[PDB]
Amino acid sequence: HMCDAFVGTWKLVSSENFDDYMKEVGVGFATRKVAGMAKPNMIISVNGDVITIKSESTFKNTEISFILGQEFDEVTADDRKVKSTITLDGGVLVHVQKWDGKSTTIKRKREDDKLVVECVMKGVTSTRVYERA
């Protein structure tokens, strides 16, 4: 019942500073422009210890499945090959991605009826708000 309040189908309803986040991550111009248009569906489910997070959009479709605390390989939507570890910290899903000596952290939390995604790369934060689909 760990992540019960995350489970469901969510749709992006607002984004702030995502272009600057993508720049900081190293995403090139054309991907930033096309990716920035996308309004993804995020679909979160849990089966036993395994959490699955799917992102479906006109840009790319991605899927990760993982066990909390256990590192895995992830190919991001912008085609980075990263090593990811996701933990729960005080009710927040904390997702760290490591690649090429770099690191970014994505936090997912429930706030009111929203699922709020905070993406941080060094000094730059983007906030992406999702509501139930």
Ligand SMILES: CC(C)n1c(S)nnc1COc1ccccc1Cl
């Ligand atoms: C998990 C989080 C960062 N996210 C949310 S929220 N919506 N899409 C993404 C994946 O990241 C993307 C997507 C496209 C291009 C570049 C990146 Cl870095």
